[PDB]
Design a protein around this ligand. Structure first.
Ligand code: HEM
Ligand SMILES: C[C@]12CCC(=O)C=C1CC[C@@H]1[C@@H]2CC[C@]2(C)C(=O)CC[C@@H]12
Length: 452
């Protein structure tokens, strides 16, 4: 088969598509192009031919194989934010990615994943006793900020554990994400004219500088430590590899940065959407509270509990299915291949539109929010909210643990009301790199009223 998608009008086809991405935002552009042309189609971002694909088979093929274990984006943009061949998230150097990832993978599983369940709970508790920091005169909680703060505190105390300005760093993290999102697929042209990106350049510097203070402190503590054997966090593992020959300081410093931002960027917005769903679906809220009573009572949440929380698990999966945050995944072809029908040369970019695929493929009632969609054990080849394979989400296991931990410990204690008729559907969303609330609008607050 030849490849569907708009005409290559001898060099105008690329400019409209890229412009459309820049104009619409990556997510809505992908959805537009999949709705117009096929669920497997071609488009251009800068030069590079870039496939936008929603077919479950292609998704599976692509994520399954090692020769798609790269992403893509502006080299000038990635350099600007420090992800060019440095971290893991947008580190597209295969060998350098290959050696860095294992650090992330160790820290996000085994004993750290077990520690996480109580670290996550204790963090939320402490922030729920300080609700004055987040609540209005009219009782409106800034949930986004609350969640971002506990997610940061959580990440810090598990992976780095240096004291920090929670409030300031959360703002800086948002600044960094905005920049990352802004520059990821900007054309080279953009980067010449400098009163168009210094804005972003400074947001990056602010976060990078703030984190350099913390890693500096962390460096001192490691050098003057007695029991080096006993207390081995992520940041330390990295720093010790730098002290062997294995890693660059620059690379370490980005990995630490990338681990701290991860949860605040994605969990906060995911749980935000999950709370608006619980607010407007009392049928499900009871099922969850019932389950929590059966399973936990008023014992502290414990690792053994999380497997048992089956209803909440389905709620999480359906929330992510129905109203995602990470609705699309950027990959790159490292070797030539035939993919379903069509041929894909190496260097071809790929945007897997997993958000669309979860409304087209396996599910009984795809366009409404119901736990009926997860009544029958869903095969992992029809529902990848995290991705899988050699470059799937490194947080995928611990993320589910963390989301259960915070939902339990919040709902345990509080009923959650949304303002007005507001719901996930009526919230106005930006749909660019991720899918998140447009925070220049308002009515995004909630009300926490107790229980018993
Ligand atoms: C609701 C929460 C989350 C969702 C939905 C999510 C989703 C994803 C997805 C779809 C990817 C792309 C994987 C692929 O290309 O196949 C990804 C990558 C990644 N996620 Fe997450 N994630 C979440 C939370 C987290 C957390 C909490 C962490 C770390 C603490 C994390 C760390 C990462 C990293 C490091 C990668 C890059 C892996 C690589 O490129 O090698 N994620 N995530
Ligand atoms: C989950 C994630 C990482 C941790 C973080 O801090 C923020 C995000 C949101 C954007 C995700 C990204 C991982 C890679 C993703 C899936 C892509 O290939 C396109 C969008 C992007």
């Amino acid at each position: 088969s030849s490849i569907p998608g708009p005409g290559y009008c001898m060099g105008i086809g690329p400019l409209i598509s890229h412009g459309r991405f820049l104009w619409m935002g990556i997510g809505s552009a992908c959805n537009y192009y999949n709705r117009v042309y096929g669920e497997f189609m071609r488009v251009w971002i800068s030069g590079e031919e870039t496939l936008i694909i929603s077919k479950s088979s292609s998704m599976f093929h692509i994520m399954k194989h090692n020769h798609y274990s790269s992403r893509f984006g502006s080299k000038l943009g990635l350099q600007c934010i420090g992800m060019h061949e440095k971290g893991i998230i947008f580190n597209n150097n295969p060998e350098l990615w290959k050696t860095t990832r294992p650090f992330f993978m160790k820290a996000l599983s085994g004993p750290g994943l077990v520690r996480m369940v109580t670290v996550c709970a204790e963090s939320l508790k402490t922030h729920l006793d300080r609700l004055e920091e987040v609540t209005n005169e009219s009782g409106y909680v800034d949930v986004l900020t609350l969640l971002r703060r506990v997610m940061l505190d959580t990440s810090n105390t598990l992976f780095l554990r240096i004291p920090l300005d929670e409030s300031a760093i959360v703002v800086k993290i948002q600044g960094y994400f905005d920049a990352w999102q802004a520059l990821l697929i900007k054309p080279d042209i953009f980067f010449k004219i400098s009163w168009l990106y210094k804005k972003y350049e400074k947001s990056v510097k602010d976060l990078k500088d703030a984190i350099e203070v913390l890693i500096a402190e962390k460096r001192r503590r490691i050098s003057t430590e007695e029991k080096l054997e006993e207390c081995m966090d992520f940041a330390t593992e990295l720093i010790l590899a730098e002290k062997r020959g294995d890693l660059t300081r620059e690379n370490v410093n980005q990995c630490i940065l990338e681990m701290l931002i991860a949860a605040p960027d994605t969990m906060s917005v995911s749980l935000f959407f999950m709370l608006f769903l619980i607010a407007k679906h009392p049928n499900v809220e009871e099922a969850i509270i019932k389950e929590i009573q059966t399973v936990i009572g008023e014992r502290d949440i414990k690792i053994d509990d999380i497997q048992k929380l089956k209803v909440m698990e389905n709620f999480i999966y359906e929330s992510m299915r129905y109203q995602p945050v990470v609705d699309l995944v950027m990959r790159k072809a490292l070797e030539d291949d035939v993919i379903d029908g069509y041929p894909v040369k190496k260097g071809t970019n790929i945007i897997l539109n997993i958000g669309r695929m979860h409304r087209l493929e396996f599910f009984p009632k795809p366009n409404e929010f119901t736990l009926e969609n997860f009544a029958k054990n869903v095969p992992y080849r029809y529902f990848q909210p995290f991705g899988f394979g050699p470059r799937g989400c490194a947080g995928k296991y611990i993320a589910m643990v963390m989301m259960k931990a915070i939902l339990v410990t919040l709902l345990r204690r509080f009923h959650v009301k949304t303002l007005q008729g507001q719901c996930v559907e009526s919230i106005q969303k930006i749909h660019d790199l991720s899918l998140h609330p447009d925070e220049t609008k308002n009515m995004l607050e909630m009300i926490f009223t107790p229980r018993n």
